[PDB]
Amino acid sequence: DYKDDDDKLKPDFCFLEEDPGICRGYITRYFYNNQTKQCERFKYGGCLGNMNNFETLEECKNICEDGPNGF
């Protein structure tokens, strides 16, 4: 229902573990890893996968890190 309000409406999917997919294509993607509360470079399968699968760190940051409030 709705989104994780309160937390300045932040994308919970960002805190979602990294998910490359099935096809071990690997494309050096990025994801917000809670392990380091930041965007970490993780491999990316393709086909399947998940949400937390950015292509650029700044992209994973703008969405996750959400520097400029929104994004």
Swiss-Prot record:
Glycosylation sites: N34
Domain notes: This inhibitor contains three inhibitory domains. The first domain interacts with VIIa and TF, the second one with Xa.
Coverage span on the entire protein: 122 to 182 of 304
Protein name: Tissue factor pathway inhibitor
Cystine pairs: C14-C64, C23-C47, C39-C60
Maturation and modification: O-glycosylated.
Physiological role: Inhibits factor X (X(a)) directly and, in a Xa-dependent way, inhibits VIIa/tissue factor activity, presumably by forming a quaternary Xa/LACI/VIIa/TF complex. It possesses an antithrombotic action and also the ability to associate with lipoproteins in plasma.
Name of the gene: TFPI
Tissue specificity note: Mostly in endothelial cells.
Site (Reactive bond): R24, G25
Superkingdom field: Eukaryota
Residue span, BPTI/Kunitz inhibitor domain: 14-64
